[PDB]
Amino acid sequence: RYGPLRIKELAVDEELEKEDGLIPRQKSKLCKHGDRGMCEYCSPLPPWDKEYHEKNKIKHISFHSYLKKLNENANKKENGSSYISPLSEPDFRINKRCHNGHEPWPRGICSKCQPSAITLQQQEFRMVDHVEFQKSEIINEFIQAWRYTGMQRFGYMYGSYSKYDNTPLGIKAVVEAIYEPPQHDEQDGLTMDVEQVKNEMLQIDRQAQEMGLSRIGLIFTDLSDAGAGDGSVFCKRHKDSFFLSSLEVIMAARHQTRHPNVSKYSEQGFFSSKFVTCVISGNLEGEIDISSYQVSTEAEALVTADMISGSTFPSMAYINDTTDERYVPEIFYMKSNEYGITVKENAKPAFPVDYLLVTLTHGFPNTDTETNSKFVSSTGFPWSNRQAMGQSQDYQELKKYLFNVASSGDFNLLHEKISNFHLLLYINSLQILSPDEWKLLIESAVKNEWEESLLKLVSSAGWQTLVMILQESG
Amino acid sequence: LINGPEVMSKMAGESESNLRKAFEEAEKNAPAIIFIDEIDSIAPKRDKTNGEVERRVVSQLLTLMDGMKARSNVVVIAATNRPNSIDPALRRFGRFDREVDIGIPDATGRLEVLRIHTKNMKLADDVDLEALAAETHGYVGADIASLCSEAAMQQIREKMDLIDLDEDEIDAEVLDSLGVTMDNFRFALGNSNPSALRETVVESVNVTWDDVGGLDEIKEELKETVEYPVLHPDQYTKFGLSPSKGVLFYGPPGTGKTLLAKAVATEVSANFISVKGPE
Amino acid sequence: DNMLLVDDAINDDNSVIAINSNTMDKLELFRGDTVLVKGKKRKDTVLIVLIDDELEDGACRINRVVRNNLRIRLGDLVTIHPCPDIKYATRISVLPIADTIEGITGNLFDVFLKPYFVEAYRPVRKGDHFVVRGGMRQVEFKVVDVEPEEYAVVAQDTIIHWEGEPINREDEENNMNEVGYDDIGGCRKQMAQIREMVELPLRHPQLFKAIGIKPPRGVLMYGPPGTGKTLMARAVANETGAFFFLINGPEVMSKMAGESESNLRKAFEEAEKNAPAIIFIDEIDSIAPKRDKTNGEVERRVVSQLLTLMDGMKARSNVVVIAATNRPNSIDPALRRFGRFDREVDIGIPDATGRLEVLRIHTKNMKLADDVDLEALAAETHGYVGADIASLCSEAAMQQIREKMDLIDLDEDEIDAEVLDSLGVTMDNFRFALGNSNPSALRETVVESVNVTWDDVGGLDEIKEELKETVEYPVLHPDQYTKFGLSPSKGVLFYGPPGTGKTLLAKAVATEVSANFISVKGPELLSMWYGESESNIRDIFDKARAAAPTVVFLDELDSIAKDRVVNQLLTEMDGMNAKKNVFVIGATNRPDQIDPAILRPGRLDQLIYVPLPDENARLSILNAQLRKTPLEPGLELTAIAKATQGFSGADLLYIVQRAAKYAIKDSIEAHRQHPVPYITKEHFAEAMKTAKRSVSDAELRRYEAYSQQMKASRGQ
């Protein structure tokens, strides 16, 4: 394209790419030179400096810094090339159309369209660094579901991305609300029809985008209470055993491949979706601390061409066999032995999945800093698909929840009782309101400076009809 | 199809898996034909390469070849310009045993190649492909293809005077008036430069007992020496006397010893190999 | 028709072109019509047509900015075409030039551009320059981006994004790529070869479809370093306008293990995916050196990857690969066969005209003084490749600065513009730079050009006739040789006393047939014999073939003809195609010492005796060597020539040099005492008194005996 590709991505990526991240350093005691001029120790530290990370207890290099490293390593300016694109996602599907003279793969294959051996190796750049929950109620209610019922749960989480200063050119995914799809949960697992779930999630995603949110991951609970009198749970997931079994890694890789991250520095324009997966199991103690993970890019491109399946051993993923329409070359997973030497071990039968993960760091915002929460909610109207419990969205619930405040006033109280995710979704499903009426509803509920917008909403006819039907209904 | 350089271009450790999977696939989908082009790149002479990977690849190839020998209907074909370049261990029983030698073509072969390549060119009616075939001595097929391409280039260069390079397109009539003439082929022959003769090769000769005068007694002696065993080995077997191996011509320079050798080769319809003094 | 003559427009508008009424009628154009104007280097722009009858028919008026953008000067020709499908610019992102915005306060856009485009509908294309005169200032700008691309009309509703950092001016100048043929001179033959081998496959593909051939892909340029190979490749690529994809050797080989191969693959894939393309692999010898060189695995994987990519592009794709190497033998031999770099191009040191052209090209921005005689520098500079000439110019400029340093204060950071005005290079600076320059092209065997005719050689009429009938006829009248089935004679071997001027005969023969002349002296032969040289006989003959019609010259061959080197020479002589116009001329002083094998038919068979010059030849030599020297008026050299019986050319040159030495000594003494602008006869008399013959009588008798033996061997 005679230069950088032209394409539009999120604002976070743009602002990150604007910066440089150089970490300044002062005159070391080892320098031998005047004030001006810098030898080798006073030079600015590149943002991708591996020593700085491992010295600061940071395990991966904040993908944007990885992009800076790749751009610096090559692409000399004004000469030397015509901008060979630096990033390219792995692709293991056999080229069905090569034709050096041979026929398609099923009955012929040369040495140019033969997928070469795949060398698994733990990734070094984590696209999304810090997953952050605006309010602990978001996950507290989610766990409360299991508390009441005892069965496991699973839900997508909506939110948006932003900068993260604590890591060089790092990103954080701030989750605002959680949405629960219709699943047939059980004791040891859960089941949910994929087709219906995606059909529902399509319109839920459309509405959320109308609200400004976005789908940025899936969170599920692997919790089993112990026999202790108080609340204690066994820690089945730690260094000794698996972190995420093969099935969860497969599902995470599928989801990541289905939410590509549009970028400007690749041949296809996308790379390594920003889609964090979180799991709740309980730390070594009786707590219910959460975690986070994200499957590496190879596993993302390793499961598009099948080639992986779950295994009875939790921590190992079974490998499939060759057949027409699916060519699976030898897989070598490269570790480092205790003597600091890299060792390649062929793993056709099964290999650990810890080479197909990168870890994140969960957290919560400081409880005495600026609160930019979109929703002051998560304690009120029943959530969507909690039919199994006594929870059930319906007219009488709305009457009991937002009739006394609505009929009198308390615009502060009305606003705080109107900025709830699930309530907004339900009243939207009611269809009692017109398009622009619902637009002003959301702009009043999910925004600051909301006085005139709420006044306009109440002054509208649609809200009057809604409150009238609420009054009519018991 | 397995290329030599292409396999050798892979990272360390990924150049053995390719061979393994190639042979395994050829076995699974039998019958199969495996053509390891430029095998010398993946199995040079033992002393030529000492790198450890160069030995891993060769040993993997040998193991795959030996294990292949079975009822499985899979045939392995390899190519290499220098017969001695290949590792000696690859030319034993159960391995590349049958050997074929390609020799530079003769006059009729050159004419056939010329007709095959020059079947699409808009050749001018005044072309004497027979004359070109006769003139080209020691031209390999690739050299003939280059000759034809250069002749076409010369023709277009000559016609370029009427063509205006500024315009992307050209007048259709001029584009349809292109035609290669004999002088173009002569110029291309002048420019071309064959390379086969730099090394010893195999080429047929077609000299009879008429381009050499006299030497009738020597002609009869050569006949008795060479022709009879080849044409009538049965009588020699009957008498149990094996034929002679070699002969040594000596005499003043320029007497036509090479012509005698070529005539002897032609009489028994045997290929001729030459080794000049500088070689 | 549409080749409107260029003229300086009265108006300063950046999107207005004035044309004559007659041309407007001829092309059916009209006032206010937007048309696409193309000039030189494929530069294009969009201009609003305005009728103006003052201009002569077929002439158009454009302003300075448009001419600069089109890279054309006044009096040139521009092609105008209709541009009816130009849409209004949805969004134009433009940034100003830093130097032009220095000292500007407030919003630049509102002050300057806001009135310029509103109610103007000026068509703007990417990469153009437009200048706005606001208040007391004039500011140039750049059309960085236009939506829709690549050009569009800036309407009132068009949104203009002026936000951004200033753009430095130095980028456009100091990065002066897109260099055309006008920056290259003295290499017209090789430039024509590269053009005919690159442009036609790309610019006019339908030719080869009609003829029905696969055009050649590879091209391998080589020659002495610093001869402008990279410049030639860049110029051809820019003129073609193809997707040039320069690849360096050191740049590729400096990557981590397992990365250089990836870079090569990505480069070839990119070139293929955007056909047409021109991949230029500079310094390929660093990527694929000779086999006997580095044997490491990392040095083998790259070569194998390059071979695979070369063998993989043989298809309908219009991709041309151009590689540059210093010598032909430095590249891996596997890369010089069919389907690969099969076409060679040889670059040779330029002649006097080439050096003059290079001097003019480089010395066009210098503040040269009046006393410049560039022809003199071209004559006095021999063997200077382009790089040496550039270094010479830089050194002359530096010497001029040093001379004018007297009126310069290093401590003070401000210099008066008057002092800078006085700066100017002079012939003395150039002569000083020549004194301090260090050429290095000749240290290796290199193709050169000679322009000696049948006038610098005295006498030898029969030998000249023999050389003519031996060399001139085969090259000029090959049809006759084909008619009579006679194969041309390959080479000849000169023998005779040293100093007879054999090199002059060789150069004359080369000049007559217009053949490049390759020289190989004794020291080079011995260095190759000892195996410590950078060139080989195979390399010499490969260069001779690629630069045909060539003339190879072996000097003092007896030193090596006393032998592996002789064996290689014999093999190469047998290898060369007879029809190829390559002639090997050997020279020696002891012919019987030559190996007999070299004298066999099909080799340096013909043997030519070169006798000592005759009295008339002596006079001719004296006159020739004294052409550019001031002689005493009325002086006749006939007596001196008569007194020099039996003296070879070197002896006469020695006599002349001694006479000049005496004259210069006398002149220096006279000036120091304070005249003798010419050379008086007494100086020549003293020089003759100090003369000495260089050949003893015994050696002359031996040469005559050998000549008589040879003649009797062919006498009956």
Ligand SMILES: Nc1ncnc2c1ncn2[C@@H]1O[C@H](COP(=O)(O)OP(=O)(O)O)[C@@H](O)[C@H]1O
């Ligand atoms: N009957 C013959 N006797 C001798 N020379 C002949 C005869 N017929 C042809 N020739 C010529 O002899 C030449 C071959 O020389 P040759 O005897 O091979 O050299 P050498 O003796 O060094 O091998 C050819 O050019 C050919 O024209």
Ligand SMILES: Nc1ncnc2c1ncn2[C@@H]1O[C@H](COP(=O)(O)OP(=O)(O)O)[C@@H](O)[C@H]1O
């Ligand atoms: N017409 C010309 N011929 C040769 N050299 C030229 C010519 N014009 C300019 N030069 C100068 O000669 C040099 C050519 O460099 P070159 O040998 O191409 O570099 P490389 O080593 O990359 O091949 C440059 O300094 C260039 O400015």
Ligand SMILES: Nc1ncnc2c1ncn2[C@@H]1O[C@H](COP(=O)(O)OP(=O)(O)O)[C@@H](O)[C@H]1O
């Ligand atoms: N017609 C001529 N005859 C002889 N020598 C000449 C003639 N014209 C010029 N010369 C001089 O003869 C010299 C020959 O030098 P050189 O080539 O080293 O010796 P040789 O010519 O014997 O090989 C040149 O320097 C040249 O100036």
Ligand SMILES: [Zn+2]
């Ligand atoms: Zn320092």
Ligand SMILES: [Zn+2]
């Ligand atoms: Zn293929």
